[PDB]
Amino acid sequence: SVPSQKTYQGSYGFRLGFLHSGTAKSVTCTYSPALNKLFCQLAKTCPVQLWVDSTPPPGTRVRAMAIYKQSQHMTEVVRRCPHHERCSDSDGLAPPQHLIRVEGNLRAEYLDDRNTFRHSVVVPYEPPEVGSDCTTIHYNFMCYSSCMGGMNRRPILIIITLEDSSGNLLGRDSFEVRVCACPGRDRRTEEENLR
């Protein structure tokens, strides 16, 4: 089967937000609203904001999962390539096979789905701190889009789900991601091509 990607704000008005990082050659992570696509370097910090209109219940969680964007590849589990899964760059929590990691959250849990074999990483939703209007999760993406035997140049979508304590859907949003050497240039290029 295939995870839903339908945008759904739900009862709490859940949606993502992204910083405005620009397209300088030196940028390590940058988001294109026109393409709904994040461009980032390998394993670098990718801040993703969570916005809500009202605070969901204690025990609410936030899950991230990757799927292939093209329909003909969508049933294939997105995973790290045969090189990266064996490079012993584990942070002690994330399984070496998982593309998506959460950085700096000791409560992050990594799931290998017993039925679909898909990977995901889930954290507790924390309401914004004092003087803050949103909550930010720092993600790392642990393979290049180009990795042979892995993503193999195929585009992927990251699905972020707000879920209750049982894992039921409360909200959903998504963005494409490209992991590449020069996110600034690739964003500029793809946006030009779009135009």
Swiss-Prot record:
Changing G150H: In a sporadic cancer; somatic mutation; requires 2 nucleotide substitutions. Changing R61H: In LFS; germline mutation and in sporadic cancers; somatic mutation. Changing S132C: In sporadic cancers; somatic mutation. Changing H73Q: In sporadic cancers; somatic mutation. Changing S145N: In sporadic cancers; somatic mutation. Changing S90R: In sporadic cancers; somatic mutation. Changing V48E: In sporadic cancers; somatic mutation. Changing Y110D: In sporadic cancers; somatic mutation. Changing L162Q: In LFS; germline mutation and in sporadic cancers; somatic mutation. This is Cellular tumor antigen p53. Changing R188P: In sporadic cancers; somatic mutation. Changing R188S: In a sporadic cancer; somatic mutation. Changing K37W: In a sporadic cancer; somatic mutation; requires 2 nucleotide substitutions. Changing H73R: In sporadic cancers; somatic mutation.
